Amino acid sequence: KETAAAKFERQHMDSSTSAASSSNYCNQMMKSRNLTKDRCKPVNTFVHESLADVQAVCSQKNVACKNGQTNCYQSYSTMSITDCRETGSSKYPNCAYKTTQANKHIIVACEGNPYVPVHFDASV
Ligand SMILES: Nc1nc2c(ncn2[C@H]2C[C@H](O)[C@@H](COP(=O)(O)O)O2)c(=O)[nH]1
Ligand SMILES: Nc1nc2c(ncn2[C@H]2C[C@H](O)[C@@H](COP(=O)(O)O)O2)c(=O)[nH]1
């Protein structure tokens, strides 16, 4: 019965590494986190920080979500992230991703008891 909180962690958290070490990281992780079974998800960001540090963003800078919701929050600090997005070649079910390492602020939507991230909105 996967909760939105848990779906966030499966799609976006990778606390086991400080950054993507190889150019194949997104192909391996998108598959292994189950993000290509229904379709190729076009864009997905992984965050290489502890869970507590990411959950804490829900008490940091309140901003508008891209869709106008008001329950989005931007990290005060940059975070280590991996941008995964489909390449030109990518075509379901043969998904293909480019791996880009970056240091950026994250913007997430939060909800719940506990009040935790449930959607990754953007990096800036
Ligand atoms: N839903 C969702 N959107 C993402 C995620 N990572 C980045 N984005 C969004 C932010 C931007 O709206 C868009 C990419 O835009 P750009 O970098 O300009 O091509 O993807 C993610 O993990 N989930
Ligand atoms: N609770 C909640 N879930 C959302 C929001 N936007 C997208 N989702 C859900 C739909 C999908 O199950 C999932 C997609 O993951 P993400 O890449 O984090 O947007 O997030 C939102 O604003 N609030």
Side-chain angles (χ1 to χ4, degrees):
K1 33 125 276 132
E2 184 170 60
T3 64
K7 183 167 187 172
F8 178 92
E9 290 180 27
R10 169 175 63 84
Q11 299 191 108
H12 300 298
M13 292 295 312
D14 184 10
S15 299
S16 77
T17 54
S18 63
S21 59
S22 115
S23 62
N24 220 48
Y25 175 93
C26 287
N27 287 330
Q28 293 158 8
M29 289 288 293
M30 294 295 288
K31 191 143 317 322
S32 79
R33 298 296 185 83
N34 261 38
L35 303 181
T36 59
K37 159 68 206 102
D38 304 331
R39 79 207 193 151
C40 305
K41 186 178 174 183
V43 186
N44 188 77
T45 302
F46 288 98
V47 184
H48 301 286
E49 301 291 340
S50 66
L51 191 58
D53 278 337
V54 178
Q55 290 170 334
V57 172
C58 298
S59 58
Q60 297 176 18
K61 179 168 41 274
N62 184 222
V63 297
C65 306
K66 287 195 145 38
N67 72 354
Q69 290 167 209
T70 46
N71 58 324
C72 280
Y73 297 89
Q74 184 208 292
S75 60
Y76 285 134
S77 81
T78 64
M79 291 186 169
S80 178
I81 65 168
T82 298
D83 178 284
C84 293
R85 57 177 81 194
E86 285 191 276
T87 59
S89 300
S90 194
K91 204 169 291 162
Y92 186 75
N94 234 114
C95 308
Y97 292 91
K98 196 214 170 280
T99 296
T100 307
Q101 190 55 41
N103 285 287
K104 297 287 185 182
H105 304 261
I106 66 169
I107 302 173
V108 295
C110 306
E111 215 182 290
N113 172 209
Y115 193 71
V116 294
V118 295
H119 147 78
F120 191 99
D121 210 51
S123 68
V124 301

